[PDB]
Amino acid sequence: QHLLQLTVWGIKQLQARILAVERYLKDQQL
Amino acid sequence: QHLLQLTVWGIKQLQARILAVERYLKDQQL
Amino acid sequence: QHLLQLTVWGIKQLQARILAVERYLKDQQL
Questions:
Q1: ∠ CA A29-A20-C24 to the nearest 5 degrees?
Q2: Measured by CB atoms within 10 angstroms of the end CB, which terminus of chain B is less buried, N or C?
């Protein structure tokens, strides 16, 4: 129903996925 | 014209780019 | 105040973070 709210949530989900990738690179020492 | 529609599409495009990175890490065995 | 404007900016910020990851993979030769 509230698509703008949904995009805010979607952006947060994608932020968490990018953060997990950044952290993975750090943790695996690339 | 419909900027909220455009942000939905943009989020989908970024999702595909993050997915490609996740898959690359897996495929290259990091 | 203008949440749709804010999501456009947020998407741009996430795009820059994904781009930095893509470039990192290239530069580190994975």
A1: 50
A2: N
